[PDB]
Amino acid sequence: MEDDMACVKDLVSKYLADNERLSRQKLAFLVQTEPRMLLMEGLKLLSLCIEIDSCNANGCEHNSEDKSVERILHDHGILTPSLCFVVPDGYKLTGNVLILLECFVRSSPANFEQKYIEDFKKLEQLKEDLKSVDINLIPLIDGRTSFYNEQIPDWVNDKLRDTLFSLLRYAQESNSLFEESEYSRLCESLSMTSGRLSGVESLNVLLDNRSSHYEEIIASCHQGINNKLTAHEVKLQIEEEYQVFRNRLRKGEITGQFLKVDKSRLLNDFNNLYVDEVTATKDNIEHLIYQFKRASPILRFLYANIGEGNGEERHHTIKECQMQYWRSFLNKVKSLRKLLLIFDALILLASIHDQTRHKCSKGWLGSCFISVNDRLVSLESTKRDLEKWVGRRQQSERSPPDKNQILISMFQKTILKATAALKDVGISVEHYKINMEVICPDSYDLILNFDVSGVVPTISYQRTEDEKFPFIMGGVELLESTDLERLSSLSLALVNSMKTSSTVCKEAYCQEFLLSGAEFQLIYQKTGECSKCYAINDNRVGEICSFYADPKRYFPAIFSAEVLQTTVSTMISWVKDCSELEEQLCNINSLTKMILVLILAHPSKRSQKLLQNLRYFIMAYVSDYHHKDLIDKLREELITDVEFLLYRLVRALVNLILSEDVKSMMTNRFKFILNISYMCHFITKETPDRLTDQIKCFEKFLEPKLEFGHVSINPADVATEEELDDMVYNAKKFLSKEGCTSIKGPDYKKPGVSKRFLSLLTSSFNNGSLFKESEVKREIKDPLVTATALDLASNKSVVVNKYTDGSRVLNYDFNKLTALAVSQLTEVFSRKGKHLLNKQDYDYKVQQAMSNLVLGADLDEILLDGGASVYFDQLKETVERIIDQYDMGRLSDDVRISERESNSEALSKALSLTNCTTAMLKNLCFYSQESPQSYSSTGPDTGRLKFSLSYKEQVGGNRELYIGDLRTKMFTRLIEDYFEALSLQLSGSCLNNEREFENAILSMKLNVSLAHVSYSMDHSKWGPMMCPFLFLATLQNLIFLSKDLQADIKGRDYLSTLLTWHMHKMVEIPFNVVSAMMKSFIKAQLGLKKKTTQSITEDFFYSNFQIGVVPSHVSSILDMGQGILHNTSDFYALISERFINYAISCICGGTIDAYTSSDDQISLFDQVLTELMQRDPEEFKTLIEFHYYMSDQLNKFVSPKSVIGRFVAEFKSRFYVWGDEVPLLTKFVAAALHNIKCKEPHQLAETIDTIIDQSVANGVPVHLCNLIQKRTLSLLQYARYPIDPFLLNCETDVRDWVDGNRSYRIMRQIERLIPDACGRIRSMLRKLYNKLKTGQLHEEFTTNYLSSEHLSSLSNLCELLGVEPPSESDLEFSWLNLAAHHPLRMVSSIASGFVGLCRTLGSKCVRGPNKESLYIKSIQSLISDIQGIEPLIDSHGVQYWRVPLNIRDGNEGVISYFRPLLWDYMCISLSTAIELGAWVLGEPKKVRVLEFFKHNPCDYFPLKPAAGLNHIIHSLRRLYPSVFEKHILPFMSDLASTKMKWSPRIKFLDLCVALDVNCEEHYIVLSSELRLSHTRTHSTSDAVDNFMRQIYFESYVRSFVATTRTLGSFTWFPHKTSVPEGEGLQRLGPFSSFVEKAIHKGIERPMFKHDLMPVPLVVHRGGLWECDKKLASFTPVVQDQDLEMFVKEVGDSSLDLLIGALSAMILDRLKLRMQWSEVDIVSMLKAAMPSNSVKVLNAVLEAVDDWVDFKGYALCYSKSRKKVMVHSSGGKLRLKGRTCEELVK
Ligand SMILES: [Mg+2]
Ligand SMILES: [Zn+2]
DSSP states (O other), rough: HHHHHHHHHHHHHHHHHHOSSSSSHHHSSSOSSSSHHHHHHHHHHHHHHHHHHHHHHTTOOOOSSOOOOHHHHHHSOOOOOOOOOOOOOOOETTTTTEEEOOOOOOOTTTTTHHHHHHHHHHHHHHHHGGGGGEEEEEOOOOOOOOOOOOOOOHHHHHHHHHHHHHHTTTTHHHTTOOOOOOHHHTTTTTTOOOOTTOSGGGGGSSEEOOOOOHHHHHHTTTTOOOOOOOTTHHHHHHHHHHHHHHHEEEEEEEEOOEOOOOOHHHHHHHHHTTTSSSOSSSSHHHHHHHHHHTSHHHHHHHHHHHOOSSSSSGEEEEEEHHHHHHHHHHHHHTTOOOOHHHHHHHHHHHHHHHHHHHHEEEEEEEEEEOOOSSSSEESSSHHHHHHHHHHHHHHHHHHHHHHHHHHHHHTTHHHHHHHHTTTTTSSSSSSSSGGGGGGGGTTHHHHHTTOOOOOOOOOOOHHHHHOOOOSOOOOOOOOSSEEEEEEHHHHHHHHHHHHOOOOOOOSEEEEEEEEEEEEEEESSSOSSSSSSOEEEEEESSOOOOOOOOOOOSSSTTTTOOOHHHHHHHHTTSSEEEEEEEGGGHHEEEEEEEEHHHHHHHSHHHHHHHHHHHHHHHOOOOOEEEOOOOOOGGOOOOOTTTHHHHHHHHHHHHHHHHHHHTTTTTHHHHHHHHHHHHGGGGGSOOSSSSSHHHHHHHHHHHHHHHHHHHOEEEESSSSHOOOOHHHHHHHHHTOOOOOOSSSSSOOOOOOOOOHHHHHHHHHHHHHTTTTHHHHHHHSOOOOOOOBBGGGGGGSSOOOOOOOOOOBBBBBBBOHHHHHHHHHHHHHHHHTTTTTTSSOSHHHHHSHHHHHHHHHHHOOHHHHHTTSOHHHHHHHHHHHHHHHHHTTTOHHHHHOOOOEEEOOOOHHHHHHHTTOOSSSSSSSHHHHHSSSOOOOEETTTTTHHHHHEEEEEEOOOOSOEEEEOOOOHHHHHHHHHHHHHHHHHSSSSSSSSSSHHHHHHHHHHHHHHTTTOOOEEEOOOOSSTTOHHHHHHHHHHHHOOOOOOOSHHHHHHHHHHHHHHHHHOOEEEOOOOHHHHHHHHHHHHHHOOOOOOOOOOOOOHHHHHHHHOOOOEEEEEHHHHHHHHTTTHHHHHHHHHHHHHHHHHHHHSSOOOOEEEEEEEEEEEEEEEEHHHHHHHHHHHHHHHHHHHHHHTTTTTOOOOTTTTESSOOOSSSSSOOOOSSSSHHHHHHHHHHHHHHOOSSHHHHHHHHHHHHHHHHHOOHHHHHHHHHHHHHHHHHHTTTOOOOSSOOOOTOOOOHHTTHHHHHHHHHHHHSSSTTHHHHHHHHHHHHHHTTTTTOHHHHHHHHTTTTTTTSHHHHHHHHHTTOOOOGGGGTTTESSSSSSSOOOOOOOSHHHHHHHHHTTTSOOOOOOOSOOBBBBHHHHHHHSTOOOOEEHHHHHHEEEEEGGGSSSOOOTTGGGEEHHHHHHHHHHHHHHHSSSGGGGGGGGOOOOOOOOOOOSSEEEEEEEOOOHHHHHHHHHHOOHHHHHHHHHHHHHHHHHHHSOOOOHHHHHHHHHHHHHHHHOOEEEEESSSSEEEOOOOXOOHHHHHHHHHHHHHHHHHHHHHHHHHHHHSSSOOOOOOOOOOSSSTGGGGGGHHHTTGGGGGGOOBBBBOOOOOOOEOOOSSSSEETTTEEEEEEEOHHHHHHHHHHHHHHSOEEEEEHHHHHHHHHHHTTTTOOOSOOHHHHHHHHTTTTTHHHHHHHHHHHSSOOOOSSEEEEEEEESSEEEEEEEEEEEEEETTTTEOOOOO
8 A cells, every 4th residue: 555655646746737836735745644644635635726727717816825805805905894704715806896716526416505505605694794895795606526627637636536545445544533424425525437538548557568579560560651642642653553554454464353244144144053963954834833742741741632531520629528628637737746547547538438429539549549748658558557556556455345446446536636736726627627427337347448440650760651642642722822721730730849848659749730620640759959850640541741850940830821822912913014924924923932832841041042142143133244253152052852943943933034025114023033032031040050050150260360371379378489470470471462563463352451552541641632621621639538338238248267376277178178078979979889780890899999998808909900009098098097087077167268157247246346336447447456557568467358259140141259358348448439439520431320321321312313323332251351450550650630749649559559459369269169179080090980071170170189289279460350340440441432432533534422331332423434334335344443453452352242233222231223112021021920039928019019110111011010910919819818908909000100109009999999988088188188288287187086096087087177977887898907916927049939938828927916826717717707797809809898896896806907998098098199299189080982993012102200308307307306316417417516596397298297207210101001091180599598588587686707617507508519600699699709709619718898899797687797887788588487487486485585686677677668568467476476466566566666568557656655556547546647546445
């Protein structure tokens, strides 16, 4: 701690600015040693700096020696009788008036105002005495809320504050020094405020251990460049480069790289794309449909001819047998945690009785049957075990009873046990209709006397059995919609197959499903979720099919039978008017369907990619130029005998639509093919297998970092010599690319940058030649001036390091790993390896030997003969010497070198070791116990920056993911925020800003409308080809602030340090990758497997495996964070593209505009270039080529999927054409299908609502939306959850979505249920709203009827408004609301989520009155047993109940849930009418007068919907202080030292807030549906005048000085917000120039007389005054309500204040001849002062002495009579030449 005071003494000696006024306290503090002394002196020093700065900023000389105002005046030459001793903190005199001052710091509005009021009273209590010497006092007060002074660099400031706070925390000293009050005040005084800066400057509190390495790096990145060229040499450089490039290209020495599109050649190249196994050139539709319906066993089963033998049994599905009830009962009671045989015999005899009564053949499959737990039960072993068990039972009895009696007696015990066990909570027994006659007299014999017959089915995993199909091949037709529901039922069976638990021939499982009267059984043999074999069976044939599907990946087909049909129908409807296409429409109507079914039968990644890659082809077919390497990118791979059929289908369809016979409609065909391409979303975005996916990522990551040749395996925490050597070497190499003036010429697709072009770019930026005029008038401010960390809490994972000693581990223990690998492989082998030609053929011997080795003589030679001799010996040695140390439990995690943790856990752990218990950034990485002290050029002292690898799913390919630890994320946030703030300055980016994207859309539309050229660009390998070194090398040569060179130099060093920190990172290799590589090495060492590939990433591992060390971490120079350094990369891209456009415009005579986000980009050409395209094609082509080459020279490549055209534009997947519009009808549907989760069923609803709302606004017709909502409701019903009207509304129209919101739709549904009751309610609500908008009652219902029992609220409201209340046969309606007292208890993939939801909503999940646990069935029973309540079900399924109010009481148990419907309807309707407009409360007028017409399906029509914060904040701080201070001040505010005591109020808004605490840029619709809908019948000037009236009102209560701190301290003020140059400058009178010249520049000084066209100004009542003279004035207009608020707030306690103020206002507004006729007085006084207006009336009217006009009268004062006289024609009394009468007699 001594070091603390030492270093802070050094700081305060050094960085304190020279001023003899600080010398005294400087010394007095720089000498003490006792802590308390240091605390006192230091705090006094800080307060001294504060008061000095304040007195400077106000203009009052500093009272230094702490004189007394008595002395201050008497040594100034005046007489003072006697005063109370006061000490001022500054003062000034001006003639006969005086100015004092006092300042302090408080950081809490509660403990703020106290000092304020205390000081004000301390000053007035002296003014009262001063008044008798003819001297005016003006009590100024100032209230700064932060110790951030001005004579001190702020980082020194907090470095002092925190060390003081720490030293002060001596427990014994703190206790035996003071009490808790001042202790608590001080600790919250050193609060570690976020300050006014970034937080990177704090780097100056560490040791700068930079060395020659950093010097070398900087000098190298700064050597050959020249960032000084004038604006005249750049053009010369460019023109010479262009000349050389053009000339050297014409001779055919550089490659073309761009073709011109010829449609026939494109179609040819697409046709024979796979021409090595698709041996054909043109296929026929008939053979296609032929072999389609027979390809795969699933497809074969779908279309076959089943269900023809259907007689009465097709109708015998409802006449249920007792076996069903008994099985359901057994399954329900089983969950209530030998007996299996009891269940078998029970169900068996139940089926026996059912067969003797009606011969129902159900639940029987050949010679087996399903008993309880989805298990298929055989026959013979059941009877065998039952006989042996009854024999053992009777034997143990005899060691007379016959087995029959034993069996008939062993039922009742368990039956009663079950009937009692279920009766723990709720459900009765009388609902499960189970006839007790099951126990027949001759039970045991009749069970022993029952055999059956049939066929025994069995799964087939061998082939040659799936070629003799029982039924006929093709029976169904495509036009119908029959196959879809077959698919639905089959998929439902598959998903349900995941339900079975472990449950622990021999074993099997079965799941039945019905199909058009028939019944089938899907059987399998292993639980859990993983690919396996299934088999379909029936009780008439056997093994219809067998296949190898996967449980999940089959969700999107459930219950979606009509959705897909309507999809295909409305898709075909697009192209049906092309005459040339008519005679083949039927053909099309087939193909589409087929494709869809295929993509839903077998989902697979390869089909997804194949379908996706078609969008680029169709985009190219319409363009003008394209990249020559395009086609080769669309030829990835294909494997099985299904995808080829898909390729042929899509080829036929493409040739059919795009054939060279058509001219009619290109737009519709474009839209059709594009929507076909977007069908890829229907499949899944998950992964087939995880491990084999976790290797392709590593391959992606490692390969480009070997061709460059820079890899450093296993770096250490302290950098050695060789690493730094090669680092500088590679940094030197990177900057040595060349081209176009050389021998070998340019080489494309190689990472690096050329010095010439880099110097050109930097020098071009440093001339202002890249700035638009609107950007050059606004000088670039330094980004250091502006930080919650909760943003970092976004659920992401965080790595946690691992320590063994004072050091941390960064290596995989080699010897420990091979033991784990060998144990794992013997584990996987010993349970499977005995299933081949065993007994020493070639390989069983070796695995058996080395497996017996680990589990606790010829074979030796037979193994070691092949040279695998010494390796085996050393392996045995190491494994036997490592196993002694211990298991599979210890080494399982020791070899692991890291582990993961959630995001909030680590944040809490870190917060527990600091002083500020909040979330600040600069506080968390710089001042804490675990914070570094010194830093080199390779990171801080605690080690270098570390990341870890993972992958991320996506549609199409996959993305990489780097995960760091806490410190790395901290240090990264700073760079990110710096570059983001810097990039906001310039125009063109679209990554974060919105309005830029809007402008991009507008420009795209405008460009397309005129057939101008457009260029759609996407860059390839944006991640692994950038590097932090490039951003560093381009930063050192940049100069933002050209005026001053003193801080930019200071700022850039920090960022150089941080980028250099990033440059030396360390990326960890995952675990499974290492383990798999080790296994493969061990296997291939002896010779066991294929040994064919040996790819580039295996020898890398092997060359280190066979020499000991294992690769653990990898460092290099050639990779930025893939998804880390976004903002900086975006900045670089923006600069680069602007420069390239500048160059191109310099060469030719055109002009280009650009828009970019991070790597996607769109470029719009101009008139001259479009014209040139048609004159000289060669010139245009060579311009494009030059653009390619130039862009390559700056490390920015171009992907072969970029296009140039005149027909279509594209940017961020938002296409555009001329006239028409392009909806992505398939993407949104596929999104909405599989988008359910496991939450409260009242949240899935709102999620689906948001999705459908977003989809309607793009072109999907509402019919599909209704169908989708109905599908979701059916999905809910399948889980047996009662539907209430507050879930969804499957009846919407277009005006419901365009105008209304969720509440409106629900209100509309309720209206639809029960009309003729809502009528009177709307009628009452009309008048209620009309009376509330003027504030008539405004108090009662919000406190009683919105609070008390709403049993008679409506009655009171209707009688209060005088309208007939609702009739009695209305208040019976209700709706069963579960979760009435507490919410429901609910504590990876999509299917698992659905299954979990189903299982959750089947157990105890409702909270009782206080605390219980009940089912849902039990509540059904309870509500059903009462015989007076009648439910009501709608056509869609919505339930609602009717309960009579006579029985509303007496039975308060079950009735505790039901709620009355009309009450909720009224509440919702009122709240909505508040939120939306008032037009809602009209009546629903529907239109139906229309004649049918030809509705062109491609005809759209845009639409826009029909839509003061200061007042909200005012009301919050005025009404709810506790909630306000903790939720608005820390969020974004500092307004503790701000006044608001004169501001208008609103009653409507007030009661709205009281209730609330009590209780979409366009639309694109079809005009075919804007015709069929419903209808419903029927600031800034404010802010400026608010400020003006605030000032005017305060001017009369007292006197206050006019300065930059007095005015800005108020609340109504335009504090440099979004305000133009002249907005309210007319409404400022004598105050216009000051705000601009002083406040709106950042200048803190008082206002002088030279500020109206050396004494400061004084604001008096209305007019401005100097020392005893008035210069000017100002007076806005007043209202009745404003005067009411005035006399409210001023006339509360005192009276003479109100009298004087009113008299003065009347006087000074009369002598200007202003008019008072706009308002009243007497009624105003009464309405304002409801009890004492008379005496104040007399007082004011006696003060004045004249006449005053008002709202329809005029009064005056009399003196002969001491009363007031009204001017009136009926009076007689004389008063100032006017007739008058009295007021009140
Ligand atoms: Mg793009
Ligand atoms: Zn039956």
